[PDB]
Design an enzyme around this catalytic site. Sequence first.
Site, PDB file in Angstrom:
ATOM      1  N   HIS A  77       0.749  -1.145   0.205  1.00 48.51           N
ATOM      2  CA  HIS A  77       0.001  -0.096   0.025  1.00 48.51           C
ATOM      3  C   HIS A  77       0.930   1.202   0.001  1.00 48.51           C
ATOM      4  O   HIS A  77       2.230   1.230   0.157  1.00 48.51           O
ATOM      5  CB  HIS A  77      -0.756  -0.089   1.172  1.00 48.51           C
ATOM      6  CG  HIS A  77      -1.733   0.899   1.426  1.00 48.51           C
ATOM      7  ND1 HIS A  77      -2.685   1.827   0.687  1.00 48.51           N
ATOM      8  CD2 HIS A  77      -1.902   1.788   2.539  1.00 48.51           C
ATOM      9  CE1 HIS A  77      -3.156   2.692   1.094  1.00 48.51           C
ATOM     10  NE2 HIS A  77      -2.796   2.693   2.584  1.00 48.51           N
TER      11      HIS A  77
ATOM     12  N   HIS B   9      -3.205   8.745   3.341  1.00 51.50           N
ATOM     13  CA  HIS B   9      -3.162   7.646   2.488  1.00 51.50           C
ATOM     14  C   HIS B   9      -4.648   7.559   2.166  1.00 51.50           C
ATOM     15  O   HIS B   9      -5.740   7.832   2.579  1.00 51.50           O
ATOM     16  CB  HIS B   9      -2.613   6.307   3.329  1.00 51.50           C
ATOM     17  CG  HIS B   9      -3.292   6.065   4.438  1.00 51.50           C
ATOM     18  ND1 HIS B   9      -3.198   4.612   4.670  1.00 51.50           N
ATOM     19  CD2 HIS B   9      -3.987   6.522   5.291  1.00 51.50           C
ATOM     20  CE1 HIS B   9      -4.045   4.478   5.924  1.00 51.50           C
ATOM     21  NE2 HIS B   9      -4.493   5.767   6.259  1.00 51.50           N
TER      22      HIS B   9
ATOM     23  N   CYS C 175      -3.644   3.609  -5.038  1.00 46.66           N
ATOM     24  CA  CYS C 175      -3.032   4.500  -3.955  1.00 46.66           C
ATOM     25  C   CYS C 175      -1.668   5.086  -4.684  1.00 46.66           C
ATOM     26  O   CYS C 175      -1.496   6.340  -4.275  1.00 46.66           O
ATOM     27  CB  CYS C 175      -2.836   3.671  -2.857  1.00 46.66           C
ATOM     28  SG  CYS C 175      -4.135   2.761  -2.252  1.00 46.66           S
TER      29      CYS C 175
END
Length: 125
Positions: free
Chosen positions: A23, A35, A113
């Site tokens: 991630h 995030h 992401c």
Amino acid sequence: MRAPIPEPKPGDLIEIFRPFYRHWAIYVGDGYVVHLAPPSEVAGAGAASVMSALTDKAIVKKELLYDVAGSDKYQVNNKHDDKYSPLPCSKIIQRAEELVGQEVLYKLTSENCEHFVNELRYGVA
């Protein structure tokens, strides 16, 4: 063993290793990151497909780095600081924190992401 992170600076890309994947996040203060996260500020884990553990949404969130690092591991990884950084640290952080609190209608895959967070560090994914 706990240790500081003296090399990175707010405005740097962070990656977050997870048990079977990874991630992405961005450092925004001397301990905190922005995030993507699962839908977690809209439903009591029982009013969305998050209950079914099958959704294609995410939210832009801010958290303490050491909570996000609880995934498994993490690293600093400015993917193109070898080529570019068109924005100063101030604007990178300002964009990151301007964009917290929205929902997005795609899952928080590594690719999504990475895409979002590169938009912060370099102005475009």
